[PDB]
């Protein structure tokens, strides 16, 4: 385990801990992780943080009725770049009618970037992921961690 | 100058966040490093190294959240860490009207030249600890003058 590999693993654990905490509490969340496609244009629409990753900061951002909780958090490598960001809303006809704006935004950014977006439903606490225009819903924590590990490789 | 404009933006962010928390009576503890290094206390909290904004400061201190207990420590115009430990003053002149937040603020002000702002969770009153003294029930004008004196 090189320092970079360990850093990546700590970031993955930080994400999965935060998502699990919010899922249990029905705390709605929208977390977009930059991959190879730069997302500066969307990062600039939010509140700049440029912060180190922690599960604690991720949770604190999404607490309901707070300044930062609406909109997307966008992450870069080992960084929380900005919160309350705008994302394009998908027009896909495959987006279930019972889903929220968070899901429409996550699929939207996944259609025009190679990013990975995680969504926590404030209705059910269910966890979903948007990638390449596809939305995969009702993920177990095992499924989420394995997705992140597969996606962080490259 | 760019530095000066950055400083005033930081002061405005702090004062807007403190005003918000005072109105809601949200307890808060914010220490700003000056010439005495505070790395030993920064290391006790959660690393952030985050840009200052009123929004982030508010989100940190929301009650019953991971980051709300402990001190935020600011250094070099950034939020270095949250949920940090500070030394509790042993002064016999701190009123028992005041909380652990205030005793920690006075304590760090006894061993550093930092400026610490405290919002009371009971009254929303704003105080500042500097050089071992605690200045209570501050107006918005007095807090801004203190921060301007401190950043100059
Ligand atoms: C064109 C447009 O409207 N883009 C949006 N993006 C995001 C991330 C939004 C949002 C609103 S409330 C919430 N939790 N997330 S709206
Ligand atoms: C020895 C010791 O414990 N020092 C402390 N520092 C800080 C900043 C504290 C705090 C603020 S709010 C809360 N519940 N605790 S206790
Ligand atoms: Cl970019
Ligand atoms: Cl939702
Ligand atoms: Cl779901
Ligand atoms: Cl409170
Ligand atoms: Cl908590
Ligand atoms: Cl208090």
Numbering used by the authors:
A (entry chain B): 102 to 255
B (entry chain A): 103 to 254
Question: Can you list sentences taken from the study reporting this PDB entry?
Answer:
The enzyme CdaA, which synthesizes an essential second messenger cyclic di-AMP (c-di-AMP) in many pathogenic bacteria, has emerged as a promising candidate for the development of novel antibiotics. The synthesis of c-di-AMP is mediated by enzymes possessing a diadenylate-cyclase (DAC) domain.
Recently, we performed an in silico design of an L. monocytogenes CdaA inhibitor (Compound 7) that binds to LmCdaA in the micromolar range with a dissociation constant (Kd) approximately eight times lower than that of ATP. The reported structure of BsCdaA in complex with an inhibitor (Compound 7) originally developed for LmCdaA, which reveals an identical ligand-binding mode, provides structural evidence supporting the efficacy of this approach.
